[PDB]
Amino acid sequence: AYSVEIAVQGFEKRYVDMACNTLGDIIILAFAPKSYAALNLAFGPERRDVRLPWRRTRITLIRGPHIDKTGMEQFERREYKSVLTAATNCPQELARLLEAVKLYQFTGVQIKMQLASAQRVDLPADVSALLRXXXXXXXXXXXXXXXXXXXXXXXXXXXXXXXX
């Protein structure tokens, strides 16, 4: 019971496009029934490829070096986004995914990844006794992504708890 979200950031639409297509190839390979003989596949209708617009902000400059206050010119940064959606139930192929994105290097393009997943929780027996139903899936971990030699293939990975 694991859910994966991959967010992807770029400057040239070419590179974020190739990134989206190659990770889509990886997902479909990663849960691929390559042979019939074992038959719990997740193409449930959660699955998407949601595209996204950007953060419109223009940053302008003086053209001239000295007096030149007539001399303006406009400049501009672009960020292009996609999100990649899947989820699955066994962990060994999830590890194949994480090691797959560990190997294939992508040019100029940020990988931010969301991994909400189920993980079991010990309780002191007092609160289990004093239990005797809603979602309450609240871990939401957080990690840094810079100033320590990483050009941002950061993985964030909130967690979902279960203790009935």
Partner: protein, 154 residues
């Protein structure tokens, strides 16, 4: 059904694109969309004597609450002469008040067009046609010109 391209690019100094159609849905309730500003709106038309007229949830006379703006809402409806008999269900987004009015006016016009073909303009026959309401179908997609990258300089 066979709808077609209805859109226009009427304006000066900045273009426009309202790619949304107007169409009748199988509930007997047509739906249409209209923007005349970058602020935008949609409509949904039921032939009914129920709640009457509705944008943004509320009855209209408190949301829009300048009278001139209210007849800017009602102007295609008053031009039609088919005022009462439809429930008017509608949604809006953006901008400023009578821009919302004339936008929702255009959308109401489009829904009325798919209700009655000859009153207003459509793409049923090659994106052409003529009725009293055919003038205000194609939206007036002029926006503000951009604040000039340059000087007052005076």
């Amino acid at each position: 059904s066979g709808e077609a391209g209805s859109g226009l690019a009427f304006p000066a100094t900045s273009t426009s694109p309202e790619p949304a159609g107007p169409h009748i849905d199988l509930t007997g309730v047509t739906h249409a969309r209209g923007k005349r500003k970058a602020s935008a709106a949609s409509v949904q038309l039921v032939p009914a004597g129920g709640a009457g007229i509705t944008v943004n949830g509320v009855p209209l006379s408190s949301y829009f609450r300048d009278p001139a703006c209210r007849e800017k809402v009602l102007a295609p409806l008053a031009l039609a002469g088919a005022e009462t008999a439809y429930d008017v269900a509608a949604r809006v987004k953006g901008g400023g008040m009578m821009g919302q009015a004339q936008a929702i006016a255009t959308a109401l016009a489009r829904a009325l067009c798919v209700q009655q073909p000859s009153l207003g303009a459509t793409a049923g026959d090659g994106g052409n046609g003529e009725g009293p309401l055919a003038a205000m179908t194609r939206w007036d997609g002029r926006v503000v010109e951009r604040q000039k990258p340059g000087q007052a300089g005076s």
